[model samples]
Target chain A: SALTQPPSASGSPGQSVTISCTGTSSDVGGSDSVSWYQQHPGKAPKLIIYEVSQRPSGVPNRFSGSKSGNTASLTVSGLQAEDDADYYCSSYGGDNNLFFGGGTKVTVLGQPKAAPSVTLFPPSSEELQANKATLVCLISDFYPGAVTVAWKADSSPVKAGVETTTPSKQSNNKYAASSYLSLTPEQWKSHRSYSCQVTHEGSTVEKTVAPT
Target chain B: QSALTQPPSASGSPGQSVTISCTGTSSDVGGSDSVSWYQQHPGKAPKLIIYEVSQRPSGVPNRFSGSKSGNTASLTVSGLQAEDDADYYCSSYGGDNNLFFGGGTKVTVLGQPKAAPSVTLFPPSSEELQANKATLVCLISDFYPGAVTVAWKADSSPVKAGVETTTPSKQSNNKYAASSYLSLTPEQWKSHRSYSCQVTHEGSTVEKTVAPT
Candidate 1:
């Protein structure tokens, strides 16, 4: 199971915590990179993760991010209550779309569920050859139901093919769910790189898949 | 914190022109010029139509535009095309770690030559409330996947505890929306009482706020 930081009780500014995002082969490809983000409540989630370890344009350095093994981490060294926001991880799937991990909520205790881990299951190479392939994206170990999955191709909108299957219950009390998409073999093969993006709590993760 | 709302402002006449507006609360527009606008055509990624509140992103036509006055921000698109007949959104940083978004406006181009279209945002009001565990709601009115963030700030400072959020269910309208929640003890809510929410889309910052009803 992917381990995560325990939820923190409310802390003063400069108080900090580290959240981790781990994945299986089906999710985080061996050479694939990870990204992290900081989302203050009620805002659009920001990109704290880029090129795996780099921050995107305009992101403050105070929101530091890193990755190791199958695990990616985001650390806010100077914990600010504003930093009391949610954090997420993302990775490049082979396709144009990105995949996100189950997000972790960093709150001052009494805050509800902490963040969760996310997994990506892009369409298998074989499935792509079949035309209209389906990819499954999952975010496990979340509570209060704040998780979502999306599919995009070449930065363009692609319809979700079906309703996500109910996530299987895990021994650790976390839940997992998935969404699907269908694309033609040419669209899948040529655009073989597809992203399975996931969002939970306030963090995000993306998984990419490309033809061998 | 109170939720902010926007008018669905849009107008276009064939190859003529179009306009739209994104409005917010006092805490969001009163202090900063951190607002932006996005243009999303069907089947395409959301592009930065406007930035720095009124500046256009590189490669964007001067015809597509943006502006801000007091608490309201607006986007105008001229020389409208069939491709311009899509959704436009405005965003800004709200005080108290919150981000606000205007209800999206859709521009549909009309007839042939010599046609025109336009849109606008009516000013929005700020809601006042007591300091008890107040609920600050950030509305990401029209987005795909309905995934977003909301942050809270007290007076210009960020808050540390009591945050909550919700994702909009996939509605029949084919738009996604979600909300985040924050909780504060009566004491914390009372002192340094201003709050803001910042909303982001993709890697771009959209809207923000600091007031809650």
Candidate 2:
């Protein structure tokens, strides 16, 4: 079985955070066999820790690894912008097998936590009467790229015909995405309001469009 | 320019030897003196084995060696062992301030074998894209020796476009995995025509099909 890991962890610069990998006695707890890897996006994973707590040559002392019982942990101190990446843990099972944790995303927080700006576009009349219509919501300028795009028709949750793209990073490091809501002319004409709701960092920004 | 080029696979029997080559341009491997090689066992991350063209890291076995000539760099594994049967990659610093990596080479230490790869076909990660187009993925995993070929077919007709197969990556269990992708229009996928992924490994082919539901 795969080792257990949290999906994400975050810390500010000058701060420290520890990520844990939990496994069984066969692999992680058998001996000092756990290792850690650091992987940046679009690059190969780099081994940083081997033999549970030993750092490879040239690796900084800010990164340390340890093991306790069935869990292995890696701690990054004095977090820096370059430290933001994915980390994975591996262990050699006693039975000639190996197990890996489902990597964790480590975020070094220092940039502004900007909320997404939303712009809603109403459906055009030509398509509104041609059996199908589309409403577009443009979300941009969000930091960290974690946002939830939701839709509602007259305050009721809309489940079908809504498609939101994955947030794409812009050249300036901000994120942008577009959500599309498809509807039939009959449904569009019957609804009093259609809302595009975007939630980011515990805040929701919404744009409501009425028939016009 | 493209990244460095490498052969898809290399093999040798126990106690034998095998050499994998990485070909690049003068701006990279030839002029720039910073070339690194990595070894990745199944399921584990890659370990830096060779750096600066031919220097081995501390604790890395002396059985693995590296050398370079002109724009090409070579990694040779002498006295191949079961543990040396993993994926290897070569990377170089291009003169243009960029790094280039070879496509990766699967090194097989033969004389020992395991079961063939298990194959599974999955739909695209997002159903939203299915409104106009579709992408199919075939996951091939848990195989030994890391040599496999993948082909996509639509209704028994060969699909020649938009099909991409990745190099086999190591799994932690001493096995290997690879993935193949097929892109199609939503109409084509929605039709009664069947879509299938066929993986050929160790002289046998395993095929998985997804019919319209």
Candidate 3:
């Protein structure tokens, strides 16, 4: 019915918000049947909650979801620079259905604004060759869309030599866009670095991948 | 699980196809690839037409279909018929007991009513199956038209939300109707929860619920 939580107007990244969704029934208390979602500016929403306390597939445990009393809550502790996103509460019912609450927007309020970082999917320690290689860069949770993924050759934007793919939607309304840049084994070895830089809302959220 | 919001009615002429769209926050429609569509005869339970997003389930006619471009998703039915006159809805798997529904849409058979309007489901591709999430949409074509409510009930309990009903706005030659948006997360949805979308019109009533797999 009604969920209660401390009002979170805005907080710095790494600050935590305790959001609770209180229902009239004991569903949240007994079955642990509650979850949470996140919506970032411009991107589609994603599932930040699952299996009561478990995170959905591919979701990082940093975004924790729990249920107590008639309340279902999601708490993001140690919020990072990318943690700026909207949050929502959800649950299933005895009728074989699901429901979502109006979402709460999380804004970064203070300074010490941490610069964004990139975490490659396969990790960069191992080298991947052209055509035979696929690298995924995760720009975890950032807000206010217009995030662009670009390739850089030796610290400069690649020209016609590189090809880019459209960004795809990931769970939790996060944009998971990728670009494929072709490089020969020789060139990859010679270059200092190849980077995937994500620019969101006028800020460079992340830049990952070494050129050499 | 998240609830859904949709329109009340939409109409088109016979032999012509009409498209109904459902909009919601990323938490529901755009949150996952698991969205579904359904169609119901006046007194029967809702039938699965589309699942996932585009793939049709077994026995679903090709004319009934679905697609998603962005955060918004849609259901389109071709070859309208007088018998097709009923209510339509779109649903998706939201976590918890929340199952989202589009406001019911009324399809008009216009002219020589041809085929019965059907429902479709677009199950997520094999790659998406691991996510354990999906969506459904229901379409009701050719209703007498009037004030109605489209709601999502789990098992038997109603998903809490304020319901609003409005008359069909003339989009083209026929009429159109719509409802508010309902959204849910995957953790909110359970396998045992039963989902249904109900429409009340002209003393007669039409309802459709999701059957367990």
Candidate 4:
């Protein structure tokens, strides 16, 4: 089995982020044979810390490695945009075996946050007659893709018949996503105002549309 | 950094010995005390056979040994057995946080059937990741003796960075499967560059190319 590591970690620039790798007594806890590898996007893994806290020549001191019990730790201080990458931990296991961590992603959230553009499209007339009305809320042009989307009918929060998609990359290096809110013809006719609210980086953007 | 170069294939009879050479420069193989060797059976994780240049990890058989001369490192399997017919790779620390691996050598026992792996190149997919990166995957499956070299190219030029391939994993049908990934920036991906993945198994090569969607 692979060592345990959090799937992701994040910190702002100038901050320090620490990731932990936990294994059994046969691996990290067995001896000081733990090593850490740093991999930038699309790049091969670089050996940052080997033999547990020893840094090879030319490795910046800002990157430190440590071990305590069955857990090994890697700390990247004075974080910068270039420090964003995936980190993996490996340990020497007996019987000609080795154990590796699943990998942890470190994100340096130093860039400016871009809010999404929210546009709500009402259901078509033919769909209304078919008793199948689907509202599409297109959210586009966002950065740092973490955002929450919610649907509101007549200013009331609605949870049923609502679906949202994960953010997708756009050609401009931004992000876009879509959310759907389905309603019956009777419910669509009764609700005069429906809104799509997008929350990104603590800011909210809402677009409301009604029957034409 | 470029990987250490090794012959694509090596072979020996069941009772004979075989040696694979991994050639590098003094900057990596000769100047480093952290050279290691790994043994990977088809469909299994790599096992560290020799570490710290020549030290075998506890419980590894004495049949596998490592040595370095000048700028080249070597791994030798003495009295080779049927079970020893696997892939062997040598690695060295290049200092400056850099590490290098041999292109890998497929050790085939004589009189064994040689099956070449089929290569499938998957187009780059946009990951909803925190970073502005896309991933291109190349799948290699149904090979025998389970040793292959995977390389990436951009518009016919060799791509050295952002490529990672896994050891071949065993499938239900006993065939081996492995995947290689190439990461690229949104800008590079949008530039509409032709990306290709090349696989070498048993001294034969196949390539697949993909264009932007």
What is candidate 2's lDDT per residue for B1-213, written digit by digit as tens?
365888888999989989999999888888776888988654344677988888886689899899999999999999987788778888886753355678778887777667698665654323324245466666566687778998888899998887656556554445666656565777768774688899999899998877654
- Candidate 4 global TM-score: 0.40
Q: Summarize candidate 2's per-residue lDDT along A24-130 as a digit string, tens digits.
A: 88889988888887877545556688888887666799999999999999999999888998898989886555577877777786577677766665664434545
In order, the TM-score of chain B in each prediction is: 0.48, 0.54, 0.50, 0.53
Please give the distance, in angstroms, between residue B87's alpha carbon in candidate 2 and its true position after superposition. Answer: 12
TM-score of candidate 4 chain B vs. the reference: 0.53
In model 2, what is the error at residue B9, expressed in angstroms? 15
Worst 10-residue stretch by lDDT in candidate 3 chain A?
Answer: A122-131
Q: Which regions of candidate 1 deviate over 4 angstroms?
A: A1-15, A18-131, A138-176, A185-212, B1-48, B59-63, B68-73, B77-213
Q: What is the interface RMSD of each candidate, in Å?
A: 19.8, 14.9, 21.2, 14.5
Runs in model 4 deviating more than 4 A are A110-168, A171-212, B1-22, B25-90, B93-213
**Candidate 4 local lDDT, A1-212, one digit each (tens):** 46997656778899998899999898899999889877664333567898889886668999999999999999999998888887889998877567888777676875556777565556654346566666766566677765677889998999897655446555566666656676886777788878888877657788777765
Candidate-wise lDDT, in order: 0.53, 0.75, 0.53, 0.74
Model 1 collision count: 103
How accurate locally is residue A154 in candidate 4, as Cα lDDT from 0 to 100? Answer: 96
Best by lDDT: 2
Q: Who is ahead in TM-score, 1 or 2?
A: 2
How many Å off is the CA of A9 in candidate 4?
Answer: 1.6
lDDT of 4 at A132: 67
- TM-scores across all candidates? 0.33, 0.39, 0.32, 0.40
